[PDB]
Amino acid sequence: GAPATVTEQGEDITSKKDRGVLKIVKRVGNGEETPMIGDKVYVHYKGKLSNGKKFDSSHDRNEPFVFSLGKGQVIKAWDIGVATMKKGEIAHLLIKPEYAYGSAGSLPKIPSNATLFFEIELLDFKG
């Protein structure tokens, strides 16, 4: 399925080139501009664990997740990943635990050492 495909066919977007965050662009967004550090970014997403379970979705809440890019308000992979996206883009991310919740996990939903899959849509970004 889509998690296997991004695992096997995604591009490494990490600065370290350690394959900790892999990406596939599913829908190309608008123009060339990506958000900048400190922008307010509006996204929709769905996340899955490696047991095949959906663990979260903003779509199901009927409103986007909003955060300030590049400030450590989210897992490292999200700061890195959303920074690569154009407005209107849909992407898949496959994230090793070192760029997510690590050995600690995040109870109750995220186990220790969890690889995460997301589908993410960048709705908008604003300074």
For residues 50 and 119, what is the distance between their CA atoms, to the nearest angstrom?
Answer: 14
How many other CB atoms sit within 10 Å of the CB of residue 69?
19
Catalytic residue, chosen from 42, 101, 117, 125, is 101
CA nearest 120: which of 14, 22, 4? 22
Residue 45 DSSP symbol: E
How many residues make contact with ligand A1H78 (CB under 6 A)?
A: 11
| Candidate residues 82, 85, 110, 114; the one interacting with ligand A1H78 per rule CB under 6 A | 110
Q: Is 91 in the site for ligand A1H78 (CB under 6 A)?
A: no
| Site string (45-74) toward ligand A1H78, x via CB under 6 A | --x-------xx--------x-------xx
CA angle 44/77/25 to nearest 5° reads 60
Site for ligand A1H78, rule CB under 6 A:
47, 55-56, 65, 73-75, 78, 106, 109-110
* Residues with catalytic function: 45, 55-56, 75, 101, 118
